[PDB]
Structure formats: structure tokens, C-alpha cells
């Protein structure tokens, strides 16, 4: 025969917690969902993996000293442009990042790996734009 | 712990006394309850962290009770020469080795009070934040300075030779 090709599938939204979950353990799952890898109809080259909006990120938990320890680096092309912000302050200002980040490096990278990150919309809250389905999960 | 006023909560023993009430939040790990007329405390097991926390907390809250039962006896004995302690209105205006008068202000939770300029009295109704400000005055003017002069609690000064040992 010849293995099957899902036609234009509908984009199923979801929603996951945040608060209480361990930062990394979360994405691990979350990731998989952004791609079709949970779906019994996954396909590499199409991105039909679930739009994961997330609620109250600001209360993400994580282990050890990572609160203080963990360092979020950023380097402009300008010599000496290396700016390293800690997980700590990173919670305090725009905490949503920390998730989106832990995440954004659990995808692959070719032009769609980033298309998929657009398929993700966390907030520190809860709240979101109640657009549709978004059936809660666990 | 007689006419006290304890109050167990998840992990915070709010205690009222004849003076005021304090809140002393410690880890729920072990066992916090009032029983029979006196408060108790007990570890979950024979474990490093557990053991330590058990002792720590037991005497923490133990003092907490005694604090609102009046545990104040801390006051500084300013030894020197031209070091005078005054108290005008709300502010203690002592004048020590510094070229200017030291402006101290009795804050929220404790009450100072200067008997005579030779020595400042502190009524402290909060065993924690008490030694803090004791140390505050004693570190506003460090004593013993080679021979003498400064701010002592009462601790005997270790000496050190005067106009000598400057080879």
C-alpha cells in the first residue's frame, strides 16, 4: 500500500494549568502536543499540533536554586552585549517568557518549529481570549 | 504559659499577651498544637533537618510566648567621655564620638527610653527585632576602640595597648 495522509484537519485547541507544575516537566508534554505526536494522525511536514494556550504561568514552580541560579542570557551583536537575567527577575518581569522559553527549545527548528511556537499562547493570569473550545486538561 | 493567648494555625502561632500580639510562622513540618494549658512541639522523625527544625521551632514559639509575656531586658551602657544620651519627644538624641548628635527613633513594635545619659534603656516586646536594634546602636558607635569609649551592652572589653605598638 502507501501510508496515509491526513487531509486538512481542524486545529484542536487545548488549555493547561501552570501553577504547581514543574517548569520543565510541563513543556516536555506541552511540546509533544504542539506537534501532532499525540495525535493518531501526526505528520512531520504540516503542523496540525494543538494550539496550547496556557493560564497562570506566573506561578510556575521549579526545583532547587534555579529561582536564583538559572540564568537567561541575551547577546546583541555589539561587543559586550551579553546580558544574563536570572530566573528570579525573569519571573518578576514578563514571567510568561520563562515558559515560552523552556518550551521553544523542545521543538525542532526548521521554518515550522517556530510556526509551532506561534501555535502557543501562554498568559500569566489565568484569563485568555476565550476564543473557543480550549478544553482544559491535566 | 499562664494568662497568655496562643493561637495555632496551619503553620503560624499568633500569640497575644498583656502587651501585644506577635505572629511566628514556622514550617508545618513536625507538630504544632496547644494542649492542656501549655503548647507542644514534636518532630516527624530522627532526621537531621527534622531534628534541627524541631528544636529551633520549639524554642522559637516558646520565646514567642514569653515575648508577649514581657521579654524586654536589653539595654546599652554607653561608656566614653563626652557621650551623652538624651530623649526628646519621640527621638533619643544621644551625642557620642560622632561630630553630631545621633538621632535614634523608637519605631513600631518596641519602646526604647533613656534613663540617664550614661546608659540607654530598651523595653523590647519582640525578642527577634530587639537584639537587632541593640546591635544597631552598638554598631552605630563601635566600642572598645583600642582602649575604650563607644557603646557597650555590658560585655567586658578586650583591651589592647594604647599610644604604643606603632613601630
Amino acid at each position: 500500500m502507501k501510508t496515509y495522509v491526513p487531509k486538512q484537519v481542524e486545529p484542536r485547541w487545548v488549555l493547561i494549568d501552570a501553577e504547581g507544575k514543574t517548569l520543565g516537566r510541563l513543556a516536555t508534554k506541552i511540546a509533544t502536543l504542539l506537534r501532532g505526536k499525540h495525535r493518531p494522525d501526526w505528520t512531520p511536514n504540516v503542523a496540525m499540533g494543538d494550539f496550547v494556550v496556557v493560564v497562570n504561568a506566573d506561578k510556575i514552580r521549579v526545583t532547587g536554586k534555579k529561582l536564583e541560579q538559572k540564568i537567561y542570557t541575551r547577546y546583541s551583536g555589539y561587543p559586550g552585549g551579553l546580558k544574563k537575567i536570572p530566573l528570579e527577575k525573569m519571573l518578576a518581569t514578563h514571567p510568561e517568557r520563562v515558559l515560552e522559553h523552556a518550551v521553544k527549545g523542545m521543538l525542532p527548528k526548521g521554518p515550522l518549529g517556530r510556526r509551532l511556537f506561534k501555535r502557543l499562547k501562554v498568559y500569566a493570569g489565568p484569563d485568555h481570549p476565550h476564543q473557543a473550545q480550549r478544553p482544559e486538561k491535566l | 504559659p499562664k494568662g497568655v493567648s496562643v493561637e495555632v494555625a496551619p503553620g503560624r502561632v499568633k500569640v497575644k499577651g498583656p502587651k501585644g500580639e506577635l505572629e511566628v510562622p514556622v514550617s508545618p513540618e513536625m507538630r504544632v498544637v496547644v494542649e492542656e494549658g501549655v503548647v507542644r512541639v514534636e518532630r516527624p522523625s530522627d532526621e537531621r533537618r527534622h531534628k534541627s527544625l524541631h528544636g529551633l521551632t520549639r524554642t522559637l514559639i516558646a520565646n514567642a510566648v514569653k515575648g508577649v509575656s514581657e521579654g524586654y531586658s536589653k539595654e546599652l551602657l554607653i561608656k566614653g567621655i563626652g557621650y551623652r544620651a538624651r530623649l526628646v519627644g519621640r527621638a533619643l538624641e544621644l551625642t557620642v564620638g560622632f561630630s553630631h548628635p545621633v538621632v535614634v527613633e523608637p519605631p513600631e513594635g518596641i519602646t526604647f527610653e533613656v534613663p540617664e545619659p550614661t546608659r540607654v534603656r530598651v523595653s523590647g516586646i519582640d525578642k527577634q527585632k530587639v537584639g537587632q536594634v541593640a546591635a544597631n546602636i552598638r554598631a552605630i558607635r563601635k566600642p572598645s576602640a583600642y582602649h575604650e569609649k563607644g557603646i557597650y551592652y555590658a560585655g567586658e572589653p578586650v583591651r589592647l595597648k594604647p599610644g604604643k605598638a606603632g613601630a
Binding site: 546583541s76 551583536g77 555589539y78 561587543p79 552585549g81 | -
Partner: protein, 205 residues
């Protein structure tokens, strides 16, 4: 952190006090306030500020003759003071009093594409001994093989002119309501008869 809009004029030295003072004047004049701003539907706290009346047909359309109060448009249109809520009416000049220090913002005139000496400032060199081929030139830029890249932002041969700067800590000694002028310790940036906003200084608050 109040403010005012203004045009530039003068620079002199008025022998006030006893000594002398380089004095730059500005006309704040009838400079409108034509639209406030509020957090939820903005995010800050601000006011738009107009200027000099001569506007007939060449302007038209939205005007903000709408807005809520018309007042027509100047011709030098309007800008924005941040963190400022006025009393309402077209503010003038006497916003500040003779005895205050302030900050002043304006474009730097155009010196365009310039030589690195007259820019950030370099050196060039050898008028004689060495050669003639590198009088007004940068000489070096970066390291041999590693980097092998030319440092991003390495002070280079380029533009230096039509820009903009805010100056801090000046001293407005005079202010005439009768003709709408404001006289400061001469330091004004930009040419005479141009665009410049005055706002209060900063120091310890």
C-alpha cells in the same frame, strides 16, 4: 515634570546680577493643549501641544477641530509632554518662574556625512613624515584573524548631524509674558527659529 513647547531665538550675555550670562531666549507663546491621554486607553499620562496659528486650507481634514474644542491647528502642529496633566487652556510661557532650572529638547542641525575626526573624534595623523595618504583617516578597525570580524559599533566614518538631543540642568533667568519669551543660561541646541521643547529639570526627584 511639567513642560512647554518653544521656538529658538537669541543667545547673548545680559550682564544681569553683576557678572555676565550667555542668554538664549525661546518663544513658548500660545502653545495649545489639544488632547490629554489616560492609562487604560493609552498607558502613560500625556498632553498634545500645538504652536503657531497660520494654518488655512493647506491643513484641513481631521483638524481635531473635532477633538472636543477645535482651536484650529497652529502650523508647526503638535507634540507630547509626558507625565503631565494641565489646567486646560492653551498654556503660554509663564509655566515656569525666574529662579528654576530645566531640561530642553531639540534637533541638532545637519552636519551630515562627516569625517571621523569631526564625528565621534579620532586622530588620523602624519601631516608629513609618514605619508600624505591618510591625513583624515581611521587607520585601524579590528583584530587580525580572530575576530576576523569588524566590531559592531566600532566608531566609524559616517553621518553626524541631523539628529536630536535633550540637555539637562540649565537656568532660565528671565521670562516675558508681554511677548511670550523665556531666557536661559545660553546652551540651546539647534538653529535659530526652530523646534524646541522645554520641560522641568531633574536632580534629586
Amino acid at each position: 515634570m511639567k513642560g512647554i513647547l518653544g521656538v529658538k531665538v537669541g543667545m547673548t550675555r545680559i550682564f544681569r546680577d553683576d557678572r555676565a550670562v550667555p542668554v538664549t531666549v525661546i518663544l513658548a507663546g500660545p502653545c495649545p493643549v489639544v488632547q490629554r491621554r489616560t492609562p487604560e486607553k493609552d498607558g502613560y499620562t500625556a498632553v498634545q501641544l500645538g504652536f503657531l496659528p497660520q494654518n488655512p486650507k493647506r491643513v484641513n481634514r481631521p483638524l481635531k477641530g473635532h477633538f472636543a474644542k477645535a482651536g484650529v491647528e497652529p502650523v508647526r502642529i503638535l507634540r507630547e509632554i509626558r507625565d503631565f496633566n494641565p489646567e486646560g487652556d492653551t498654556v503660554t510661557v509663564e509655566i515656569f518662574k525666574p529662579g528654576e532650572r530645566v531640561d530642553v529638547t531639540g534637533t541638532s542641525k545637519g552636519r551630515g556625512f562627516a569625517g571621523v575626526m569631526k564625528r565621534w573624534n579620532f586622530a588620523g595623523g602624519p601631516d608629513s613624515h609618514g605619508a600624505h595618504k591618510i591625513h583624515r583617516h581611521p587607520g585601524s578597525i579590528g583584530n587580525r584573524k580572530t575576530p576576523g570580524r569588524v566590531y559592531k559599533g566600532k566608531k566609524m566614518a559616517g553621518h553626524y548631524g541631523a539628529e536630536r538631543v535633550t540637555v539637562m540642568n540649565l537656568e532660565v533667568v528671565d521670562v516675558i509674558p508681554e511677548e511670550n519669551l523665556l531666557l536661559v543660561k545660553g546652551a540651546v541646541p539647534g538653529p535659530n527659529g526652530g523646534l524646541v521643547i522645554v520641560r522641568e529639570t531633574k536632580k534629586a526627584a
